[PDB]
Amino acid sequence: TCPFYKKIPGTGFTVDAFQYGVVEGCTAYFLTHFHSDHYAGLSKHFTFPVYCSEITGNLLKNKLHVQEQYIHPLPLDTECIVNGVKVVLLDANHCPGAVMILFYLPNGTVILHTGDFRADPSMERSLLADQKVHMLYLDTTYCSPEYTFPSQQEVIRFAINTAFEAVTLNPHALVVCGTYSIGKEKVFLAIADVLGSKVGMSQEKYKTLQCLNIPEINSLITTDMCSSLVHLLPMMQINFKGLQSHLKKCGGKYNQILAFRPTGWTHSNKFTRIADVIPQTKGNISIYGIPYSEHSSYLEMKRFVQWLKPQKIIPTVNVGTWKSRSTMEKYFREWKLEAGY
Numbered sequence: 001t002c003p004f005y006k007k008i009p010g011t012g013f014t015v016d017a018f019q020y021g022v023v024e025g026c027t028a029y030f031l032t033h034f035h036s037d038h039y040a041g042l043s044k045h046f047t048f049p050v051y052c053s054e055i056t057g058n059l060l061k062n063k064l065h066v067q068e069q070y071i072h073p074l075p076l077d078t079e080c081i082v083n084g085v086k087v088v089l090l091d092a093n094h095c096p097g098a099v100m101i102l103f104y105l106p107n108g109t110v111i112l113h114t115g116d117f118r119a120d121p122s123m124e125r126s127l128l129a130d131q132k133v134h135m136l137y138l139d140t141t142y143c144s145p146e147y148t149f150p151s152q153q154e155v156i157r158f159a160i161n162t163a164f165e166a167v168t169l170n171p172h173a174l175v176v177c178g179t180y181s182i183g184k185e186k187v188f189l190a191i192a193d194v195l196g197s198k199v200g201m202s203q204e205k206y207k208t209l210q211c212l213n214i215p216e217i218n219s220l221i222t223t224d225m226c227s228s229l230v231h232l233l234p235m236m237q238i239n240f241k242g243l244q245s246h247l248k249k250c251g252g253k254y255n256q257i258l259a260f261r262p263t264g265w266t267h268s269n270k271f272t273r274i275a276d277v278i279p280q281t282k283g284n285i286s287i288y289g290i291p292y293s294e295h296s297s298y299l300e301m302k303r304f305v306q307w308l309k310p311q312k313i314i315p316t317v318n319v320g321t322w323k324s325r326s327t328m329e330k331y332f333r334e335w336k337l338e339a340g341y
């Protein structure tokens with residue numbers, strides 16, 4: 001049974017609700033982005049209308065085999081009528097194809113569903129500037145003040161400078177980057193660009209990247225591993241055993257691995273500056289965990305909500321425990337008393 005925080009009142013609509021069977025009264029299923037916890041349940045046998053971005057619809061058709069007649073892609077930043085209700089899709093600053101959804105209800109209520117997002121001051125000059133929002137369905141993944149991390153630009157600077165130094169010292173070093181979903185493509189693309197290399201990967205991952213509308217992508221990626229000195233591997237293989245085994249497969253072309261694990265937040269964030277991050281090393285293998293986030297920090301979340309001034313907040317992450325729910329509600333009330341709405 002579909003939880004209440006996935007249902008849009010006064011409509012036939014649900015958001016990210018594909019694992020509950022046929023939801024009673026649902027006439028259109030929205031999908032915010034192509035991450036498995038959100039698309040869980042979709043397959044080639046799905047027969048109701050799915051509403052999403054163009055990039056999400058490419059992934060549904062090629063990766064999950066959803067038939068074309070049920071995929072309804074919408075352009076961004078454009079007023080659209082769906083089943084009699086005005087909607088807008090906005091860039092969520094999450095992974096490729098990820099959107100927030102603005103719903104203009106027939107009774108005059110306006111609802112914003114963030115999906116998953118990384119709040120940014122540029123959102124204060126989107127189509128959100130133009131009218132009031134009554135209800136906010138909020139990605140609360142990092143809703144606590146301990147969750148700090150750097151900008152994506154600082155993290156990429158660290159990665160590029162680290163990789164360029166290592167491979168210039170040793171031209172026989174291989175760089176490896178972990179992945180297990182779409183998102184965070186800038187990590188491996190920025191490193192390959194500084195090294196003058198294409199990124200090498202499996203046929204399955206190449207197929208996925210070919211769905212993303214990234215400009216000039218054919219110039220940047222390849223399935224020919226032998227031609228590349230930046231390789232992508234599954235995240236599970238980013239450990240000393242997995243990496244030793246990969247280096248064996250490269251036929252004595254390389255004699256050192258430098259590997260990156262983009263995580264979200266880890267508790268090494270509460271003590272250490274990005275500047276000061278060091279790797280774990282065993283022999284000729286070194287592994288860096290880098291805090292590249294595609295979700296809001298606490299401070300970015302608080303600035304967005306204090307700007308928007310919603311009448312009601314419905315969290316969509318960390319909803320399973322009473323302690324989490326009570327913590328989130330306390331911060332919402334602080335924010336509202338501080339700003340005066």
Ligand code: NI
Pocket residue numbers: 033035094116
């Ligand atoms: Ni996500």
